[PDB]
Chain A
């Protein structure tokens, strides 16, 4: 199993280091791939490291800049990115396949997103949307949050049925914002709870909200 870490926001020109920790046994045959995906674009192979020596192969998009290392006992791999551009804003995955020796299975991480801009980290300002006779709808609107991502799952997974959470829109002010909605019984008078399950990872802003007509 693969887990990435070390994301966040970085200033153009400044640098950041990402970690990829693997679980299980480790053979000298094994290795590690780094693949990134820009917001709304395709996949791009960044580099590979091979544990059986000095061989590291980079993409010409990052050659001479990105550097990959590891320590064996921690079973982690690092990629220190430097001289970052806006073009390098992407979700970064580490990956191993069985079909070329890098790993025992075709493993991927969850990906951690790095964003390259001088904008500052800001917590989300959530607001309720009152439903006020036909199946009703209600929601939380998250406003002025930077950078992505954000997660919501009403009632902490208790009421997660037929919920649409629209992708974030980038307001020209520079702050993302979105909202989520749940269609609910027509007259759900005095329902148990409706907890705004919103968490911002970059800014530790875990918040909850009431949605009562």
Chain B
């Protein structure tokens, strides 16, 4: 038994109508439930018996469908509704789940506020230096960040992690760490991260000098 869930991912701003389709490989009558799972937290029942609505779940959420085709509808989308939604069938002995659907909000661009952080003296006695560049409260996700060490472009020594979209201002925040040796940190002086984003008209660079 297979639950085919479409789409895999959709984006829409606040107040939009969102429909998530769940196609059943077989006849499942109306024994289908809809769950919501926000990042880091356990799932939450939204709908049961295809159309019946849970307790404490708003009337903006609705379910319809019978036989093999099922749909979860969100009439007006709210910023706290960013999560992953899944379908489950309870027709027989076992439970079959759906592929899931990621929801995220569109909003007018917010410029990232960049901050530079030198590696601490405690992390230098270890023998491995780590420099981090932080971009805060921006949209869309896509941002570039180049590391310069003594005015030389770096490559292969960085890794990036983005947060989940904040449930209030609907903005992301990107971290970028640069790792090198204590000798490689002592062998150079000028460390900079140049970031580019759709919000900023010109690439904004923050830098520090080792010793100041």
8 A Cβ contacts from A85-133 to B:
93, 95, 97, 99-100, 106, 108-111, 125, 127-131
Q: Which of A93, A127, A165 contacts B42 (CB 8 A)?
A: A93
In the complex the two chains form, is B136's CB within 8 Å of A164's CB? Answer: yes
Tell me what chain B mostly uses at the interface: helix, strand, loop, or mixed: strand
In the complex the two chains form, is B100's CB within 8 Å of A42's CB? Answer: yes
B186 within 8 A of A: no
Contacts of B137 in A (CB 8 A): 183
Closest to B179 in A: A171
In the complex the two chains form, is A166's CB within 8 Å of B115's CB? Answer: no
In the complex the two chains form, is A127's CB within 8 Å of B123's CB? Answer: yes
In the complex the two chains form, is A169's CB within 8 Å of B163's CB? Answer: no
Do A108 and B43 contact each other (CB < 8 Å), given the known contacts A171-B159, A181-B173?
A: yes
In the complex the two chains form, is B97's CB within 8 Å of A42's CB? Answer: yes
In the complex the two chains form, is A179's CB within 8 Å of B132's CB? Answer: yes
Contacts of A179 in B (CB 8 A): 132, 175, 177
Q: Which of A45, A97, A128, A137 contacts B134 (CB 8 A)?
A: A137
Do A45 and B96 contact each other (CB < 8 Å), given the known contacts A137-B134, A137-B136, A141-B130?
A: yes
Contacts of A45 in B (CB 8 A): 88, 94-97
A18 within 8 A of B: no
**With the chains together, A1 CA to B126 CA distance in Å?**
45
1/0 per residue, CB under 8 A from A, across B85-115: the answer is 0101010011111111000000000000101
In the complex the two chains form, is A137's CB within 8 Å of B42's CB? Answer: no
Contacts of B127 in A (CB 8 A): none
B54 within 8 A of A: yes
**With the chains together, A75 CA to B45 CA distance in Å?**
23
In the complex the two chains form, is A110's CB within 8 Å of B132's CB? Answer: no
A159 within 8 A of B: no
Do A141 and B132 contact each other (CB < 8 Å), given the known contacts A48-B94, A128-B120?
A: yes
1/0 per residue, CB under 8 A from A, across B143-171: the answer is 00000000000000001111110100000
A200 within 8 A of B: no
The smallest beta-carbon distance between A87 and chain B, in angstroms, is 16
Contacts of B161 in A (CB 8 A): 166-169, 178
8 A Cβ contacts from B47-98 to A:
48-49, 54, 84, 86, 88, 90, 93-98
Closest to B33 in A: A99
8 A Cβ contacts from A160-181 to B:
164-169, 171, 177-179, 181
In the complex the two chains form, is A42's CB within 8 Å of B117's CB? Answer: no
In the complex the two chains form, is A169's CB within 8 Å of B159's CB? Answer: yes
Contacts of A100 in B (CB 8 A): 90
In the complex the two chains form, is B163's CB within 8 Å of A167's CB? Answer: yes
The smallest beta-carbon distance between B72 and chain A, in angstroms, is 15
B118 within 8 A of A: yes
A147 within 8 A of B: no
Contacts of A97 in B (CB 8 A): 33, 45, 48, 90
Contacts of A143 in B (CB 8 A): 123, 130
The smallest beta-carbon distance between A3 and chain B, in angstroms, is 11
Contacts of B48 in A (CB 8 A): 97, 99
Given A129-B132, A131-B115, A181-B115, 5 additional A-B pairs, CB 8 A: A43-B97, A57-B94, A137-B115, A137-B136, A179-B177
The 8 A-B residue pairs with the shortest CB-CB distance in the complex, in nearest-first order: A108-B42, A106-B45, A45-B95, A166-B161, A129-B117, A164-B173, A57-B93, A42-B100
